[PDB]
Amino acid sequence: HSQELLKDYIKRQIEYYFSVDNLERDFFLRRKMDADGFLPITLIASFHRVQALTTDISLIFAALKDSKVVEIVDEKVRRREEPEKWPLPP
């Protein structure tokens, strides 16, 4: 119980970054994607609103695994739906 609510806030914050509404304006995030849409999870962990909530990387991974919006492969995360649409030149 001790971290379940915290995990939900983290999950919702990260789902915002990967929302279409945010992605349409988030040129920084898109420049950090690889060509398949993947971003380092540690980059996401450094963002102010996530870091305010936690610095516990297992908790961040556990939150991402609870999401239908994103998917994790090893150290990286991407939007599940058409991730290839979003990357931009660095």
PDB file of C-alpha atoms in Angstrom:
ATOM      1  CA  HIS A   1       0.000   0.000   0.000  1.00  0.00           C
ATOM      2  CA  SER A   2       2.890   2.309   0.971  1.00  0.00           C
ATOM      3  CA  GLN A   3       3.594   3.294  -2.683  1.00  0.00           C
ATOM      4  CA  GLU A   4       0.407   2.449  -4.612  1.00  0.00           C
ATOM      5  CA  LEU A   5      -1.032   5.963  -4.744  1.00  0.00           C
ATOM      6  CA  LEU A   6       2.396   7.399  -5.556  1.00  0.00           C
ATOM      7  CA  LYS A   7       2.684   4.896  -8.426  1.00  0.00           C
ATOM      8  CA  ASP A   8      -0.681   6.053  -9.790  1.00  0.00           C
ATOM      9  CA  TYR A   9       0.403   9.724  -9.784  1.00  0.00           C
ATOM     10  CA  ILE A  10       3.665   8.812 -11.517  1.00  0.00           C
ATOM     11  CA  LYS A  11       1.815   6.734 -14.122  1.00  0.00           C
ATOM     12  CA  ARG A  12      -0.620   9.518 -14.901  1.00  0.00           C
ATOM     13  CA  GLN A  13       2.130  12.121 -15.176  1.00  0.00           C
ATOM     14  CA  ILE A  14       4.096   9.985 -17.629  1.00  0.00           C
ATOM     15  CA  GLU A  15       0.960   9.190 -19.632  1.00  0.00           C
ATOM     16  CA  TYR A  16       0.526  12.958 -20.037  1.00  0.00           C
ATOM     17  CA  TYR A  17       3.973  13.286 -21.651  1.00  0.00           C
ATOM     18  CA  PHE A  18       3.011  10.518 -24.085  1.00  0.00           C
ATOM     19  CA  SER A  19      -0.423  12.004 -24.879  1.00  0.00           C
ATOM     20  CA  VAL A  20      -1.114  13.283 -28.379  1.00  0.00           C
ATOM     21  CA  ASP A  21      -1.921  16.710 -26.983  1.00  0.00           C
ATOM     22  CA  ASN A  22       1.494  17.026 -25.400  1.00  0.00           C
ATOM     23  CA  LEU A  23       3.369  15.352 -28.256  1.00  0.00           C
ATOM     24  CA  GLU A  24       2.031  17.896 -30.770  1.00  0.00           C
ATOM     25  CA  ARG A  25       4.064  20.565 -28.924  1.00  0.00           C
ATOM     26  CA  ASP A  26       6.831  18.638 -27.131  1.00  0.00           C
ATOM     27  CA  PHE A  27       9.638  19.051 -29.604  1.00  0.00           C
ATOM     28  CA  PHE A  28      12.327  18.354 -26.973  1.00  0.00           C
ATOM     29  CA  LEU A  29      10.882  14.954 -26.122  1.00  0.00           C
ATOM     30  CA  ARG A  30      10.497  14.040 -29.785  1.00  0.00           C
ATOM     31  CA  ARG A  31      14.145  14.978 -30.524  1.00  0.00           C
ATOM     32  CA  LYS A  32      15.179  12.520 -27.769  1.00  0.00           C
ATOM     33  CA  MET A  33      13.334   9.612 -29.344  1.00  0.00           C
ATOM     34  CA  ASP A  34      15.055   7.004 -31.418  1.00  0.00           C
ATOM     35  CA  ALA A  35      13.548   6.267 -34.806  1.00  0.00           C
ATOM     36  CA  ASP A  36      11.175   3.715 -33.240  1.00  0.00           C
ATOM     37  CA  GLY A  37       9.865   6.254 -30.672  1.00  0.00           C
ATOM     38  CA  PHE A  38      11.798   4.885 -27.674  1.00  0.00           C
ATOM     39  CA  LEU A  39      13.192   7.180 -24.963  1.00  0.00           C
ATOM     40  CA  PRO A  40      15.389   6.308 -21.952  1.00  0.00           C
ATOM     41  CA  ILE A  41      13.279   5.817 -18.864  1.00  0.00           C
ATOM     42  CA  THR A  42      15.944   7.682 -16.902  1.00  0.00           C
ATOM     43  CA  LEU A  43      15.323  10.752 -19.085  1.00  0.00           C
ATOM     44  CA  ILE A  44      11.661  10.642 -18.080  1.00  0.00           C
ATOM     45  CA  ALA A  45      12.717  10.181 -14.435  1.00  0.00           C
ATOM     46  CA  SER A  46      14.686  13.430 -14.575  1.00  0.00           C
ATOM     47  CA  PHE A  47      11.664  15.532 -15.562  1.00  0.00           C
ATOM     48  CA  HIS A  48      10.669  17.927 -12.795  1.00  0.00           C
ATOM     49  CA  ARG A  49       7.157  16.636 -12.128  1.00  0.00           C
ATOM     50  CA  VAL A  50       8.336  12.997 -11.906  1.00  0.00           C
ATOM     51  CA  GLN A  51      11.411  13.777  -9.843  1.00  0.00           C
ATOM     52  CA  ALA A  52       9.238  15.752  -7.433  1.00  0.00           C
ATOM     53  CA  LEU A  53       7.260  12.545  -6.765  1.00  0.00           C
ATOM     54  CA  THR A  54      10.136  10.060  -6.614  1.00  0.00           C
ATOM     55  CA  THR A  55      13.686   9.128  -7.475  1.00  0.00           C
ATOM     56  CA  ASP A  56      12.978   5.389  -7.112  1.00  0.00           C
ATOM     57  CA  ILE A  57      13.549   3.804 -10.520  1.00  0.00           C
ATOM     58  CA  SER A  58      11.803   0.474  -9.690  1.00  0.00           C
ATOM     59  CA  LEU A  59       8.717   2.490  -8.723  1.00  0.00           C
ATOM     60  CA  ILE A  60       8.826   4.360 -12.061  1.00  0.00           C
ATOM     61  CA  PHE A  61       9.147   1.072 -13.977  1.00  0.00           C
ATOM     62  CA  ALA A  62       6.299  -0.433 -11.962  1.00  0.00           C
ATOM     63  CA  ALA A  63       4.120   2.603 -12.809  1.00  0.00           C
ATOM     64  CA  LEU A  64       4.947   2.280 -16.568  1.00  0.00           C
ATOM     65  CA  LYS A  65       4.076  -1.388 -16.531  1.00  0.00           C
ATOM     66  CA  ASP A  66       0.638  -0.403 -15.253  1.00  0.00           C
ATOM     67  CA  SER A  67      -0.017   1.749 -18.356  1.00  0.00           C
ATOM     68  CA  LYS A  68      -1.928   0.925 -21.568  1.00  0.00           C
ATOM     69  CA  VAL A  69      -0.545   4.123 -23.177  1.00  0.00           C
ATOM     70  CA  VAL A  70       3.155   3.232 -23.175  1.00  0.00           C
ATOM     71  CA  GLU A  71       5.308   0.147 -23.517  1.00  0.00           C
ATOM     72  CA  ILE A  72       8.727  -0.676 -22.111  1.00  0.00           C
ATOM     73  CA  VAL A  73      11.565  -2.547 -23.792  1.00  0.00           C
ATOM     74  CA  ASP A  74      14.593  -2.952 -21.535  1.00  0.00           C
ATOM     75  CA  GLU A  75      15.665   0.578 -20.453  1.00  0.00           C
ATOM     76  CA  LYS A  76      13.384   2.506 -22.812  1.00  0.00           C
ATOM     77  CA  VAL A  77       9.733   3.501 -23.163  1.00  0.00           C
ATOM     78  CA  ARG A  78       7.515   4.646 -26.036  1.00  0.00           C
ATOM     79  CA  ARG A  79       3.911   5.451 -26.866  1.00  0.00           C
ATOM     80  CA  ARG A  80       2.207   2.225 -27.959  1.00  0.00           C
ATOM     81  CA  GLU A  81       0.050   3.757 -30.727  1.00  0.00           C
ATOM     82  CA  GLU A  82       1.944   4.712 -33.910  1.00  0.00           C
ATOM     83  CA  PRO A  83       5.186   5.578 -32.083  1.00  0.00           C
ATOM     84  CA  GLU A  84       6.992   6.011 -35.415  1.00  0.00           C
ATOM     85  CA  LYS A  85       4.914   9.168 -36.136  1.00  0.00           C
ATOM     86  CA  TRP A  86       6.580  11.262 -33.465  1.00  0.00           C
ATOM     87  CA  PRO A  87      10.426  11.235 -33.582  1.00  0.00           C
ATOM     88  CA  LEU A  88      12.100  14.428 -34.795  1.00  0.00           C
ATOM     89  CA  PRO A  89      15.638  15.414 -35.888  1.00  0.00           C
ATOM     90  CA  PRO A  90      17.869  16.304 -32.903  1.00  0.00           C
TER      91      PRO A  90
END
